[PDB]
């Protein structure tokens, strides 16, 4: 079924980057209508629309308990495109956990980890790699479920490679990426287990500020260094075992599981199907 522009009722914004914003799908004009996510292009360039034109036959193709819903894609604007998805109420896990802190319990922070484990794993059968996982990019449903979202970074796997090179980087979230991806800008399923390891260390400090990972390693470096040379003394800090703290609080087989993702050797990362079996054994456990 299609979605005529016209009858898309703008409601809020909801982040931006591309944006996002909530709108009524209204045909019928008495705002009974259905309240979906939408993001569009804000630059629209050449350039940018094949990206997003790819993002959205990304998400198509992806069906998942933990992977946002894709609902459909309005034209009514071909070179502006507007991605119609499922509305999620409770916004990015960020939020999320920052406003309802340790009220969520470890066992909540297990049950969250182990639907990002298994919404990754499925993301891997299809060859895909998220590259920008992190805690802002995951949404929550309800109180039970979370869905991973923003596709943006997104890329395919060549067909004989296992890995993806970025030849020349826009924005990147540098604090989650893996030596490698920092040194050569190679991308894999092993460099978004490093970044899982990063998205476990958020969840166990409830996103305090002073111990978010920009704040933790910018002091490991130094607060001094400046531009290109914090990727500089950040490739140096993970090549000599710098690694991210021991979250207060945080259990000791978790930590564990941080450390593993945190390996700079690329094949002995775990995977996502043994992190998903090994988070459900804690979870049962306790
Ligand atoms: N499907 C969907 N529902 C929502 N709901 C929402 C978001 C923020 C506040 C309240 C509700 N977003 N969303 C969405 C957002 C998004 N990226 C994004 C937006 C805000 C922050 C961080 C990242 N990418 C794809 N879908």
């Given at each position: 079924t299609q979605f005529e522009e016209r009858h898309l009722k703008f409601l809020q914004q909801l982040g931006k980057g591309g944006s996002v914003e909530m709108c009524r799908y209204d045909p019928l004009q008495d705002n009974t209508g259905e309240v979906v996510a939408v993001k569009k292009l804000q630059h629209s360039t050449e350039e940018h629309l094949r990206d997003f034109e790819r993002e959205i036959?990304?998400?198509?193709?992806?069906?998942?308990?933990?992977?946002?819903?894709?609902?459909?894609?309005?034209?009514?604007?071909?070179?502006?495109?507007?991605?119609?998805?499922?509305?999620?109420?409770?916004?990015?896990?960020?939020?999320?956990?920052?406003?309802?802190?340790?009220?969520?319990?470890?066992?909540?922070?297990?049950?969250?980890?182990?639907?990002?484990?298994?919404?990754?794993?499925?993301?891997?059968?299809?060859?895909?790699?998220?590259?920008?996982?992190?805690?802002?990019?995951?949404?929550?449903?309800?109180?039970?479920?979370?869905?991973?979202?923003?596709?943006?970074?997104?890329?395919?796997?060549?067909?004989?490679?296992?890995?993806?090179?970025?030849?020349?980087?826009?924005?990147?979230?540098?604090?989650?990426?893996?030596?490698?991806?920092?040194?050569?800008?190679?991308?894999?399923?092993?460099?978004?287990?490093?970044?899982?390891?990063?998205?476990?260390?958020?969840?166990?400090?409830?996103?305090?500020?002073?111990?978010?990972?920009?704040?933790?390693?910018?002091?490991?470096?130094?607060?001094?260094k400046q531009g290109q040379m914090i990727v500089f003394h950040l490739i140096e800090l993970l090549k000599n075992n710098g690694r991210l703290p021991r979250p207060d609080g945080c259990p000791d087989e978790i930590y564990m599981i941080m450390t593993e993702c945190w390996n700079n050797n690329v094949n002995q990362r775990p995977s996502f199907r043994d992190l998903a079996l090994r988070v459900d054994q804690i979870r049962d456990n306790m």
């Open positions: 036959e990304i998400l198509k193709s992806l069906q998942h308990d933990n992977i946002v819903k894709y609902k459909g894609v309005c034209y009514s604007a071909r070179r502006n495109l507007k991605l119609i998805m499922e509305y999620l109420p409770y916004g990015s896990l960020r939020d999320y956990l920052q406003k309802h802190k340790e009220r969520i319990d470890h066992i909540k922070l297990l049950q969250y980890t182990s639907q990002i484990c298994k919404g990754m794993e499925y993301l891997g059968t299809k060859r895909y790699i998220h590259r920008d996982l992190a805690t802002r990019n995951i949404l929550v449903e309800n109180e039970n479920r979370v869905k991973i979202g923003d596709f943006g970074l997104t890329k395919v796997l060549p067909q004989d490679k296992e890995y993806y090179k970025v030849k020349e980087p826009g924005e990147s979230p540098i604090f989650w990426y893996a030596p490698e991806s920092l040194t050569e800008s190679k991308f894999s399923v092993a460099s978004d287990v490093w970044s899982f390891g990063v998205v476990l260390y958020e969840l166990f400090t409830y996103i305090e500020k002073s111990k978010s990972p920009p704040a933790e390693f910018m002091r490991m470096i130094g607060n001094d």
